[PDB]
Amino acid sequence: SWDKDVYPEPPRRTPAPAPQTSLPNPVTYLTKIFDLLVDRPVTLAREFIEQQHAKNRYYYYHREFRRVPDITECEEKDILCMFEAEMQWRRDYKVDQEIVNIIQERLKACQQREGESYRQNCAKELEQFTQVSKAFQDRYSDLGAHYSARKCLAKQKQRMLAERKAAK
Amino acid sequence: AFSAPAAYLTHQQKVLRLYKRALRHLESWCVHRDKYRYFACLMRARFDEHKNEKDMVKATQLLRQAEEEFWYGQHPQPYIFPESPGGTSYERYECYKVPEWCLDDWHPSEKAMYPDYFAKREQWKRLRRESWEREVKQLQEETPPGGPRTEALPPARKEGDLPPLWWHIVTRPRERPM
Amino acid sequence: SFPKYKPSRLATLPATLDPAEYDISPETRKAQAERLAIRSRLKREYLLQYNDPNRLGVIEDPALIRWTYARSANIYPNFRPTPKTSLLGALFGIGPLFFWYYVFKTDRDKKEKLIQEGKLDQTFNISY
Amino acid sequence: KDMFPGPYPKTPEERAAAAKKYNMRVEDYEPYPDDGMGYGDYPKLPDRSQQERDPWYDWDHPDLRLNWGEPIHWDLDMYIRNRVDTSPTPVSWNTMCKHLFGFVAFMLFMFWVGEIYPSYQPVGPKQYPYNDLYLERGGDPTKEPEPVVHYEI
Amino acid sequence: KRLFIIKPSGFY
Amino acid sequence: MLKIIIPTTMLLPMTWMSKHNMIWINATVHSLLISLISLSLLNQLGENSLNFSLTFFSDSLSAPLLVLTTWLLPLMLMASQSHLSKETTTRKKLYITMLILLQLFLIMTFTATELILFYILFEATLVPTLIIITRWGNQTERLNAGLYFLFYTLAGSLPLLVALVYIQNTTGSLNFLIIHYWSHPLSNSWSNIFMWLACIMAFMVKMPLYGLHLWLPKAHVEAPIAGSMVLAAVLLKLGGYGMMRITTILNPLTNYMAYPFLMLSMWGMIMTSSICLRQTDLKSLIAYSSVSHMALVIVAIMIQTPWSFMGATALMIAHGLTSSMLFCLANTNYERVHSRTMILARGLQTLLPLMATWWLMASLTNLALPPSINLIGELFIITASFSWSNITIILMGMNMMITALYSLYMLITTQRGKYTHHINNIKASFTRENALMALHILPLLLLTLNPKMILGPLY
Amino acid sequence: GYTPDEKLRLQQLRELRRRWLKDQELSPREPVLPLQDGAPWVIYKTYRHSIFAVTHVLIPVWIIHYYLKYHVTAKPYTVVERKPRIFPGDTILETGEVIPLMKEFPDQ
Amino acid sequence: PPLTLEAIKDRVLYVLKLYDKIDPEKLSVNSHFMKDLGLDSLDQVEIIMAMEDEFGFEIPDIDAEKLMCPQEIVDYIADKKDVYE
Amino acid sequence: GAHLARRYLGDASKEPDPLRMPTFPPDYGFPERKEREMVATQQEMNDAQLMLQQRDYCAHYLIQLLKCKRDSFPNFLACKHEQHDWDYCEHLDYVKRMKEFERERRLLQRKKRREQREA
Amino acid sequence: MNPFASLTLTTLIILTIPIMMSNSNIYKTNLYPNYVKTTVSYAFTLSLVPLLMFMHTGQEMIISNWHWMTLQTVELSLSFKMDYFSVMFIPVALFVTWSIMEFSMWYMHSDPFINRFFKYLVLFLITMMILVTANNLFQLFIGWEGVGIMSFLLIGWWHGRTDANTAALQAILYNRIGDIGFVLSMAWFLTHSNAWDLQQIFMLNNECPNMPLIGLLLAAAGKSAQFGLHPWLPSAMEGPTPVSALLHSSTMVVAGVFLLIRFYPLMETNKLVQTMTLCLGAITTLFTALCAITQNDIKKIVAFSTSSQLGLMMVTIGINQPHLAFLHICMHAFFKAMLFMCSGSIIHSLNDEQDIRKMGGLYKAMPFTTTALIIGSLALTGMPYLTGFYSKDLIIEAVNMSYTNAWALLMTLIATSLTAAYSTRIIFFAFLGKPRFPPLVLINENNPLLINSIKRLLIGSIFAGFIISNNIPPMTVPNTTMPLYMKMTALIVTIMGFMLALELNNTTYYLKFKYPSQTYKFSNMLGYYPSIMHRLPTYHNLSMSQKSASSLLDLIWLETILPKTTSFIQMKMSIMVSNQKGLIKLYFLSFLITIMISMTLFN
């Protein structure tokens, strides 16, 4: 049920069977035996369980957090606003970690899927992960074990001052 | 079963031990039986040559030189009997050996499984318990005033007396307990 | 004249090749007999307790108690700050710490210098 | 209790008492040198591994090759049969060290010589299509590669 | 010629 | 947190008013139920801590330690039953009361929201531990060990009290939440340097640091089994918990000041693991291994990186379990043969087979066989240090090798070889001892399946 | 050689040791405490074989295939297969085809 | 391989009979090599070595020197191999 | 191994250097040289998932061999002729590389001959 | 494709069922070993299916069934890499384990804890399967350490033997020294590539640096008993012969070579690491073959042969020919396992006798074992069209036809000659000649388990190389054309070694005695590496521990510094304060002094 856009997979191109020999193919008969002995019972069991699940269907919801004022707009020593903003920053930290995870999963799946042509046919995913890794490292790397919204803000300010100096 | 050692090894015993070591190492070098027999007869002749030397100083010097020759000529990997010290099977069954006192701690149900054996074990326990006092008395009597000057232990002097300090030797775990 | 066997600390001299085993005197034989006497007395005491049908428990060996005490308790009471003890203690206690400080500090300072000069590769180093 | 190890013996009477305590002959008993290292009264027994002791003798403790009441070497745990062994070797220790280290050094030196003169076959470099597989080997597709051309011999 | 096997109590 | 605290307090009246026969049974049952209650704390919101009240809060760091303490109490009672059987009813009740007071103090220390209250409860643990060691120890050296433990810890702690009062005066609050949220950076001045030293040194003493670890061997060797269990599993971990908590205040100076303690811990881990190789007493060997692992934890805390902190938490929990189990396994042999000399009892695998398997599993966990939580923590710490300096791998790998060597040397010497002939008092292992070993081992192996529980807040 | 005391002692120990060894011999009775399974002739020929086959291979295969149903659908990228090699041949989905130039000189 | 006492005696007498220096006819279980037969010490060493090779177990030198009789060899082998019949 | 003998024991300048090869330009000598022709298309090699080392001028025979092997299975002895074709192509390429080595040898000797001509 | 994953996972899961049933009553019953063997055989039969699917269509897969834990940007999950290496090695290892267990049933029948032996063997197989089928470095580490621990347990199967415990500790020590490199590689990959999965590691590390590859090489040297860490494998023969044949002969030792093969894409980039691997392989081959030449224990000889073959595989890796290295692993499994089983049969027949000098004239006494050993030795020595010919002959030809360190190539050829030499040694001393074993003759090879177990491996040795080589897809460009002498170099060297070994062995018959040469001492003493290396470092480390860390610092100097000195100062001050004089005249003067000093100092 996973979204294809979030988890892209290249279209599957499977060569058609083109036997050139009289000898029976063992894999075909073994696979038919597997289908009959295993796949059919498994499919029937899953059919029964899915019927049971459909009999009592209940839903769970994905929580939505409204955006709250950031640390930049929080006054000094304003522990309420600082607490709200820091919790928001931590949630965003987790979300960015998950984003990096998704891109890395794309990377590994591409490495496996392409095969011996991984170096060339996986370039786009590698570029995506390179961009994401650079962004993530700049935003969150080196903050330390006691990472806080204030420290990330200070790092961003340091980076911006360095950029202004580069502007000269 | 090992006999009590002596304070020193006599010159004859040292020569005999050198002879045995030389023959075994030669057999290690001489893998085939025929070559071993030929060179072993040679070694026996070598010992016989100075078998009857009268001067003890000369014989001692000969033994020393022979030991030096042995150390130079020892086989780097001498054959070791499988169960001998240094052998492949030395102490292999040690873990399987279990002391007799362990059976006393068996649960009564376990001892029930082997009734006749435990009856016989009770008989042996009675024998040891009766014999201990007489064994201590005999050891005290035979012991010299200064103290025991050798590890040897006296045999049973009179009928109805077990050899002193006999329990562990008699009841030692079987060589192949399984 | 086969080459002689140079004994070492991890290669003890074989008794067969012991220069003293072939120069024996009356006193040496007497000493050997006395040593056997000591061993025989100790073995007699041990075997008497070991074959006692009433004994139940360990046969406390004083030698083991002495070994443990000497290796743990007796050390400091019989220690005196001496030139050898003091110098060896200094070297083997504080010497390694300063060596490892030098090593790690130099490495870390180099790394920090490279980072400052933007001349270090952390393209995918996003998990510290 | 007097049985416990004590200070370094200085008077001859203290040496005799220490020898009696450790169940040793007075002549045999030699204390560790009194250098403040904590050995104190404990005997300085010969540095022989438990392997060296006669296997055939019926020791009080067979595995350790030790006897009840015998003075225990200060480094017995180091010298147990599992741990270091000092038994005499067929060849001299110095000869073994020289031979082994020489073999290792010669092997490494010959490897260096081989690196200096590495074996190969009388063949030219392998030729690969499409500019040495520049695209296949990860080269930038947009940036046109410097052309590599292989001609028929 | 079965021989009794001396082993520790396994009941517990 | 009162859901746990109040029942623990009620444990005391139950123990005192219980019948002479039923003291151990009631204490064990209700302590186990309390531990079951503590499992609710493991459910931790990722972003924020569980702020139950002004006084008490729990996070992903405190929760595992609280669960560990609540679990440890029943195991301690089970282990201590045997040697206190001869003791009179009043003394047995007093011993149980000391254990219960220790649990109460540890829980309040872990859940306390104010550094001064944390200090009061963290120092308060000395009294029950000191009483246990010096009243129910079996050796004449129990008193000297108690003096060393008490004075090492107090000499470390008191400057911490002064520093905390000074912080209260300057910042205005010692509540951890406010301190974390405000947390102004420190400056590199001699006064701030000494404040950093005062804050760190008490926890550095509690977590045996090389040069300040002398109390640990004496106390663990000379203490009763329960006291050794608490000291290894929980009391050492108080230092790690405090150091992880306290490090927020000392942000910048930690880089400059870490090097002495970092070097001391890194070299001391090798030194103590080597010490374990040549130890002649089983308890002392276990204690030195504890010292080495806590040195690893100290390195993790000083580096101050998220992976290092996760490894530190995981290692704290895993080591507490493994060291407690090892102490109990040694205590069984001590009770049977009444000596702590390793050589004296040999070949115990033939005599006591299942205890041999318990020893094998404990030693494997000690040497960090994966996927043990011990290995998870050690590996995370090792990776964090590798980031800190690639050269760190040499010492850490050497320590891993030495740890494997000494653990398997203990296993081989105690449980392998020919049985000591003269010893005749070895008797079939009781269900109680095997149950204690299983209660130690099973939670440790199970925790591998879900390791996020012991990976700490930074997870 | 043996001293007379040594010979006498060793012979007495021999007698006692042999008596102990004979005592260690088990009697004809080794009482075993006395049917949870009521299958007295279980076809040793095939019933055990088919039961083992089902229990060890058939049940685990069913369980693992059901777990494949669970894990593949629940999580993307859980199972990733190397893209099948495509030679100048037809493809099932799009029925495409191509040939490899074939300009190659045939003789060899 | 029960290795009964009679088998041990038979094999020891086998080895001794195949020994040229010993004349087979006068060889007996109680024929002391030193006294009844004419074997010297080195012959004692050789015979002990032959026995240990025949049975595959090494007799320690201290015990080996004291055998001085075939029946002694048989009983010592029985003790080492735990032969009770 | 004799070429190594000439290279090391004899004059190094005369013998070609394997890493340096080919120093002389293709244009020198050889008045007209045709470009080596690769029958296999790049997309075909990528689709067949040929190893980069195996993506050589003889790749077409390898593609044919892989397809024959896939189709013939179960029979694994039915591709001997295609295997021979690919092996022969590899043999031709190896011979070409040897010819390159010989060309370098002779060219270096000619260069030395020019230097001799100066003196 | 759908059946592939299910069958591949079921093959591993089925093995665990006997471990789970160890808790049940079957463990108590005699049926447990047969149940474990049957489980292994069924697992092999199932494993054949995925192998056939791969042979048909190269259906490689990666299965991440369970998500263990996500650590910030790093996800650790249980992932199995069912690629060519795993899909092929699983059947080979399962077949070898099946034969070895059938043989063990006969060999270990007397052993009281036979059920424990079989359970430990199944556990080792499970750990090795984890090692082979791993897509994460952490899961591979789980398999690595599990194999090490199972080797420790099985090698010291007889806890009574002090030698066995020493061998187990030695194996653990060397393998842990290797594992230092494994930890280094894991840390480097996590820190730089931010992943422990092989796929991302390959993707990101286009040009792998040196440090992680050197750490992997150290781990491979530790597991495969390369020079410097080689002693553990020969000492491992202290364990029961089935344990040696299964783990320390054919399956466990190959792990390091398998570790390097798994990282072959990274290995290609770095030239220095390839050269180091080649040199280490050459050193191992030459040294181990030379040591084996003069060894008088059959198990020792076979173990040194295994070490030399591992060195040859490492050389193949150094030549940048990994798939050939994997093929050699596969074939060595068969023939070396069969050889060790034959040695076990000889040992059992001759009442636990392992010295070749005491074994002779067994060619007719044991016909089937003699046939199995002859076939195995021929395959090991590269007899054409046997299992060895398909792997070793190609390995040698590739080594010749490539840019290579000259001494490495020379050493490899000499090593092949020495392999022929020691095969001749075993055959000549044991099977040929006149019987030298003790009089009572108990030779009886007529056991169905022994005969069938050796039969399966004999058929595998004879025919497997052809089948595997033909079926596997071509993975290297062949060395088509080469000089005739280059092509025949392997046969020429092997035959020369055969001739020289046979000539020297015949000279033993001659009634001439010469005192041992120094070279013979060097070979027989294993190069003196054990004697000096197992004593000098151990003595120094333990003595340093006790003398310095335990006493000089912990018990003396630290105590003197912090506690003792402070207590002494306090005691002296207490003696000063409590002067115990109590005289009014004395301390009232102090009051006067105090008053004057106060008036001056504080105004």
Chain D residues within 8 Å of chain J (Cβ atoms): 37-38, 63, 75, 77-78, 81-86, 89-91, 93, 96-97, 99-100, 103, 107, 110-111, 113-115, 117-121, 138
Do I50 and I63 contact (CB within 8 A), yes or no? yes
Residues with Cβ within 8 Å of J579's Cβ and at least 6 positions away in sequence, in order, are none
**Helix count (H) and strand count (E) of chain H?**
4, 0
Return phi, psi of residue J80, to 5°.
Answer: -110, 125
CA distance I81 to I88: 10
Residues with Cβ within 8 Å of F371's Cβ and at least 6 positions away in sequence, in order, are F448, J138, J142
Q: Say yes or no for a CB contact (<8 Å) between G9 and B117.
A: no
Q: Say yes or no for a CB contact (<8 Å) between D114 and J406.
A: yes
Do J389 and J469 contact (CB within 8 A), yes or no? no
Residue of D nearest to B95 (CA): D63
- Which residues are registered as beta bridge partners of D43? D31
Taking contacts as CB-CB distances below 8 angstroms, the residues of chain J near I69 are 473
Tell me if there are at least 3 CB pairs under 8 Å linking chains J and B.
Answer: yes
The three-state (H, E, C) secondary structure of F296-353, written as one string: HHHHHHHHCCHHHHHHHHHHHHHHHHHHHHHHHHHHHHHHHHCCCECCCCCCHHHHCH
CA distance F396 to J176: 12
Do G82 and A5 contact (CB within 8 A), yes or no? no
Taking contacts as CB-CB distances below 8 angstroms, the residues of chain B near H61 are 13, 16-17, 20
Do D81 and D65 contact (CB within 8 A), yes or no? yes
Give the number of other CB atoms < 10 A from CB of residue C120: 13
D119 touches C at CB < 8 Å: no
Do D24 and D73 contact (CB within 8 A), yes or no? no
CA distance J150 to J168: 10
- Which residues are registered as beta bridge partners of F175? F114
CA distance F131 to C57: 31
Tokens standing for residue D1: 């209790």
Q: Say yes or no for a CB contact (<8 Å) between C126 and A130.
A: no
Angle at F424 between CA F419 and CA F425, to 5 degrees: 115
The three-state (H, E, C) secondary structure of chain B, written as one string: CCCCCCCCCCHHHHHHHHHHHHHHHHHHHCCCHHHHHHHHHHHHHHHHHCCCCCCHHHHHHHHHHHHHHHHHHCCCCCCCCCCCCCCCCCCCCCCCCCCHHHHHHCCHHHHHHCHHHHHHHHHHHHHHHHHHHHHHHHHHHHCCCCCCCCCCCCCCCCCCCCCCCCHHHHCCCCCCCC
Buried b (16+ CB within 10 A) or exposed e, F202-213: bbbbbbbbbbbb
B85 touches J at CB < 8 Å: no
Q: Which residue has the tokens 């499977």?
A: A14
Tokens standing for residue J395: 């390995």
Q: How many residues are listed for chain B in this entry? A: 178
Angle at F346 between CA F340 and CA F350, to 5 degrees: 130
Tokens standing for residue A17: 């069977």
Taking contacts as CB-CB distances below 8 angstroms, the residues of chain D near F417 are 63
CA distance A158 to A148: 16
Distance set, CA F347 to CA C49, F350, F420 (Å):
21, 6, 7
Q: Which residues of H are catalytic?
A: 40
Beta strands G79-81 and J61-71 are antiparallel
The shortest CB-CB distance from J6 to any of G68, G75, G77 is to: G68
Buried b (16+ CB within 10 A) or exposed e, I62-100: bbbbbbbbbbbbeeeebbeebbebbbebbbebbebbbeb
D44 touches I at CB < 8 Å: no
CA gyration radius, chain C:
30
CA distance H33 to H16: 10
Which among A101, A131, A155, A117 has a CA at the least distance from the CA of J194?
A101
Q: Say yes or no for a CB contact (<8 Å) between B177 and E6.
A: yes
CA distance J425 to J293: 7
Taking contacts as CB-CB distances below 8 angstroms, the residues of chain B near J296 are 28, 77, 79
CA distance F87 to F90: 8
Taking contacts as CB-CB distances below 8 angstroms, the residues of chain C near D38 are 74-79
CA distance F302 to H44: 75
Chain centroid offset of residue B152 CA = 13
Which among F106, F139, F123 has a CA at the least distance from the CA of F219?
F139
Chains in touch with G (≥3 Cβ pairs < 8 A):
A, B, E, H, I, J
Taking contacts as CB-CB distances below 8 angstroms, the residues of chain G near I39 are 100-104
Burial, J499: exposed, middle or buried (Cβ in 10 Å; 0-12, 13-18, 19+)?
A: middle
Q: Please report, as a single letter, which amino acid is at residue J392.
A: K
Tell me if there are at least 3 CB pairs under 8 Å linking chains A and H.
Answer: no
CA distance F270 to F251: 28
The three-state (H, E, C) secondary structure of G54-73, written as one string: HHHHHHHHHHHHHHHHHHHH
CA distance C88 to D36: 12
Q: Which of residues 43-62 of H touch D (CB under 8 A)?
A: 60-62
Give resolution in angstroms. Answer: 2.9
Which among J118, J93, J98 has a CA at the least distance from the CA of J108?
J118
Taking contacts as CB-CB distances below 8 angstroms, the residues of chain B near C51 are 132, 165-168
End-to-end CA distance of chain I: 33
The shortest CB-CB distance from D77 to any of F278, F420, F421 is to: F278
Tell me if there are at least 3 CB pairs under 8 Å linking chains D and F.
Answer: yes
CA distance B29 to B75: 6
**Smallest CA–CA separation between H11 and chain J, in Å?**
10
Which among J325, J321, J198, J305 has a CA at the least distance from the CA of J254?
J325
Q: Say yes or no for a CB contact (<8 Å) between J60 and G60.
A: no
DSSP state of A58: -
A159 touches C at CB < 8 Å: no
G51 touches B at CB < 8 Å: no
G81 touches J at CB < 8 Å: yes
Which among D38, D45, D51, D95 has a CA at the least distance from the CA of D75?
D45
**Which run of H or E residues covers position J67?**
strand J61-71
The shortest CB-CB distance from F259 to any of C72, C101, C127 is to: C101
G48 is in an annotated binding site: yes
Q: Say yes or no for a CB contact (<8 Å) between D137 and A117.
A: no
Residues with Cβ within 8 Å of D62's Cβ and at least 6 positions away in sequence, in order, are F418, F421
CA distance A21 to A56: 53
Tell me if there are at least 3 CB pairs under 8 Å linking chains I and H.
Answer: no
Give the number of other CB atoms < 10 A from CB of residue I7: 19
Q: How many CB pairs under 8 A join G and J?
A: 58
Do F251 and F183 contact (CB within 8 A), yes or no? yes
Q: Please report, as a single letter, which amino acid is at residue A82.
A: M
Which among F36, F151, F24, F33 has a CA at the least distance from the CA of F99?
F24
Q: How many CB pairs under 8 A join D and J?
A: 89
**Which run of H or E residues covers position A120?**
helix A118-121
Angle at H72 between CA H70 and CA H78, to 5 degrees: 105
Q: Say yes or no for a CB contact (<8 Å) between J480 and I73.
A: no
Taking contacts as CB-CB distances below 8 angstroms, the residues of chain C near J535 are 10
**Smallest CA–CA separation between C88 and chain J, in Å?**
8
Do J383 and J498 contact (CB within 8 A), yes or no? no
C59 touches D at CB < 8 Å: yes
Q: Say yes or no for a CB contact (<8 Å) between A146 and F182.
A: no
Q: Say yes or no for a CB contact (<8 Å) between D151 and I26.
A: yes
- The approach used to solve this structure was cryo-EM
